[PDB]
């Protein structure tokens, strides 16, 4: 009760608007590759292990 408030009888109405802040898109998709498979399957690397 310690905030300002609007009082309504049976003829009154209430409304407000709001804007969202910038947020990244939800990703709706699955990846068709896996992280350990990103290489070219036909070629050797020039590095060594």
């Amino acid at each position: 009760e310690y905030f300002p408030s609007q009082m309504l009888r049976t003829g009154n109405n209430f409304q407000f608007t709001y804007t969202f802040e910038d947020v990244p898109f939800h990703s709706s998709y699955a990846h068709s590759q896996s992280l350990d498979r990103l290489m070219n399957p036909l070629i050797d690397q020039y590095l060594y292990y």
Binding site: L42, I43, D44, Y46
Partner: protein
């Protein structure tokens, strides 16, 4: 002459013979034999005493 007439370098561009159909990393050293011919002109102006 401290700045003589410059030297002029000329070369035939290498043309490979057909490569293998599976990739290989070694440099191609298989070539079609070629030579070239042409004309060359040189004109010098000389001062007389």
């Amino acid at each position: 002459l401290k700045h003589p007439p410059p030297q002029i370098l000329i070369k035939n561009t290498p043309v490979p013979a057909d490569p293998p159909t599976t990739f290989n990393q070694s440099k191609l050293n298989s070539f079609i034999t070629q030579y070239s011919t042409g004309q060359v002109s040189v004109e010098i102006e000389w001062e007389l005493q």
